[PDB]
Design a protein around this motif. Sequence first.
Motif, mmCIF file in Angstrom:
data_model
loop_
_atom_site.group_PDB
_atom_site.id
_atom_site.type_symbol
_atom_site.label_atom_id
_atom_site.label_comp_id
_atom_site.label_asym_id
_atom_site.label_seq_id
_atom_site.Cartn_x
_atom_site.Cartn_y
_atom_site.Cartn_z
ATOM 1 N N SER A 140 -11.912 -0.764 4.349
ATOM 2 C CA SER A 140 -10.891 -0.634 3.319
ATOM 3 C C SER A 140 -11.073 -1.610 2.135
ATOM 4 C CB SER A 140 -9.485 -0.805 3.927
ATOM 5 O OG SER A 140 -9.293 -2.130 4.400
ATOM 6 N N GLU A 141 -10.494 -1.239 0.991
ATOM 7 C CA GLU A 141 -10.485 -2.136 -0.169
ATOM 8 C C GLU A 141 -9.731 -3.410 0.121
ATOM 9 O OE1 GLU A 141 -9.805 -0.296 -4.074
ATOM 10 O OE2 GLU A 141 -9.822 1.658 -3.072
ATOM 11 N N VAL A 142 -8.598 -3.342 0.844
ATOM 12 C CA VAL A 142 -7.869 -4.586 1.111
ATOM 13 C C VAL A 142 -8.682 -5.539 1.953
ATOM 14 C CG1 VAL A 142 -5.426 -3.910 0.755
ATOM 15 C CG2 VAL A 142 -6.494 -3.566 3.065
ATOM 16 N N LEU B 54 0.823 -1.216 0.000
ATOM 17 C CA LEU B 54 0.000 0.000 0.000
ATOM 18 C C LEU B 54 0.859 1.270 0.000
ATOM 19 C CD1 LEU B 54 -2.762 -1.274 2.458
ATOM 20 C CD2 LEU B 54 -2.957 -1.035 -0.036
#
Lengths: 377, 377
Positions: free
Chosen positions: A363-365, A310
């Motif tokens: 979050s996207e993760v 990230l």
Amino acid sequence: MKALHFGAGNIGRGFIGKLLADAGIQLTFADVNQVVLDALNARHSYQVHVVGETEQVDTVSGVNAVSSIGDDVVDLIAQVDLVTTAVGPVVLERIAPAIAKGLVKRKEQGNESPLNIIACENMVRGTTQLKGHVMNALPEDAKAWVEEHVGFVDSAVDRIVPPNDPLEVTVETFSEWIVDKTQFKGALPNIPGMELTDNLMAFVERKLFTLNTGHAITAYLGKLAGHQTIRDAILDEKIRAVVKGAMEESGAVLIKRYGFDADKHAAYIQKILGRFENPYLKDDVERVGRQPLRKLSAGDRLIKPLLGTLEYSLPHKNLIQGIAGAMHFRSEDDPQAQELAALIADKGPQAALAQISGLDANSEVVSEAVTAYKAMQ
Amino acid sequence: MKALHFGAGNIGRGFIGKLLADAGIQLTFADVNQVVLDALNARHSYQVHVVGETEQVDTVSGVNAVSSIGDDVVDLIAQVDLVTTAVGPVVLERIAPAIAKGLVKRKEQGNESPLNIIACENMVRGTTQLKGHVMNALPEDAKAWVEEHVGFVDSAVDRIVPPNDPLEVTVETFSEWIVDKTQFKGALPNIPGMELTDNLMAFVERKLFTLNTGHAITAYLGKLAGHQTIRDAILDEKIRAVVKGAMEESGAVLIKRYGFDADKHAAYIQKILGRFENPYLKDDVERVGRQPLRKLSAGDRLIKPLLGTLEYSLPHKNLIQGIAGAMHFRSEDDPQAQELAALIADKGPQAALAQISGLDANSEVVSEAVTAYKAMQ
Ligand code: NA
Ligand code: NA
Ligand code: NA
Ligand code: NA
Ligand code: NA
Ligand code: NA
Ligand code: NA
Ligand code: NA
Ligand code: NA
Ligand code: NA
């Protein structure tokens, strides 16, 4: 040269003590296990099965042993050139009063030959942690003398040593022992298999982000595919692709962060894949996958590399697969695996992952990991 | 001023958050417990029963809450003047990626007002430990800015807060909150009940060697005498004499080591005896005595003061009684107490004590402790 090594367990006998004795250093082990103490003092030698390409049997000789809780160990600390440890965090604290008493006696005997202490532990800067414990047990009037004469040298160590003869041990061919050059006092020792660096943290992170990351993901995906051993899992081409890819993704972070040469790092990744192929270890995936809560923590072998990707806008799809495999680890014998299962059951995988790892639940993760988790059931 | 406090448990609500809100600071709690989050956001206030001389009911008001695992907490870190924690070592690591993301956002918003972070934990220099975790999650390109703008201030905290309303908490009247003045960035906050020092380690050790030592010995001797609570035990004149004497023996070490005034230290000992007399807490000796292996470790509240008395040739007879009482602690619900019992059963009290504490098994102090242990059966 003379060395005292605390912890005559598998790591001490098969790796650290082995290298010290192989270097021609007069080695004494210290431990509390009387069976191991008596066996070492009875035979002064033992066999280490070193296995990888072939099975080699090496003999470690001229060694002896003392109790870590008696008075002889104190006398030895006053005499030896090196003290090493492989004891774990609880015993690392417990040995501190004996080391401190040893250092007081070293001063009182007038031994001004430099002493270096190297903790070889599955910890970051374990010797600095040991130093903290020793300071807590040392008289104030000895502190200046200890600062002048004693080096507390941090290390990064790596050797796979899985679980009649109480001294025999089996270890992989490969080992790595790297120590912080800048912390040694006096002339640097020549110990084959021990490398000195100005940049220890680079090697610490390399091992965490490559060996630990790869080894864990192999175990977790292997268990999901019903593979018994690390070797079985890594020879499964679907699993191998994800393990190799995750070590490569984490490797791009290490290359950017520390400046490792890309071609040498590719070769280090190949070397680790070969280590997982070892046909003599028969290492159970359940053993390697144990403690998934620890292994899913913010600073550990799956989340820290992800945070790095990230940071640098690098690709983490294989890391995400690894995290989802970790989240699936189940073991009756492992309380963390039980806690993990109960947490996902109670709160769902998204909240569970965020609560264990520290990643934002939105979050996207986290989204990607939950998808991957769902896909593996 | 604005503060965010991680950990809305009993300590957070009854001690740290309470003092912050009482100072007129706009306080937000962060937690993962949805029941506590909703109760705080629903009512914006709660009652703390403050008990000692009398029972007082204090109201904490104007507070709110956010999830520690969502995105609002990150936004808050970018805005507040103080971040505090009371979460324990596992969660101290877990909150690090949110803090790091918060600091990146603080920089990106251009908030250059100094931020100070204070971990209020049952750990030595917990905020320095938190800093380590935050560094592990922060991008390299933010590190310089964080060094300039953010203080990681260590603390030493002391308040006895034992185990329908999910927000009410009962706490003793007494509290202590001391922080390292030298680590703050910018103007020092005026928070009543928080004291600033140049010498935090002196206060850390004072609390360990007096409150923790006394409290543990009260619990251990009390359990042996069949006393239910800390109050029952401390009012037993035989036990009180040993508890007071042990705190005095440890106190002579602190006086010599740190230069504390002897008359004030005597008064601090009297104040701690009064804290143990609290008639409203009904604190079970079994709770206070829990984890005896930890409490018998080299750096902890019984062995470290003993080592200090050896350093300075000072008297430790009451400390020895305390160690023998600890060695006798039995609890079905406590795995350490089980491990302890099994170790003494397997190896005998002398070897057992040496193996847990790090004291030489041959030593006079170990001899004295074994005598005392035998005398109490
Ligand atoms: Na070898
Ligand atoms: Na030398
Ligand atoms: Na190159
Ligand atoms: Na986001
Ligand atoms: Na994301
Ligand atoms: Na108060
Ligand atoms: Na300010
Ligand atoms: Na004075
Ligand atoms: Na002795
Ligand atoms: Na002694």
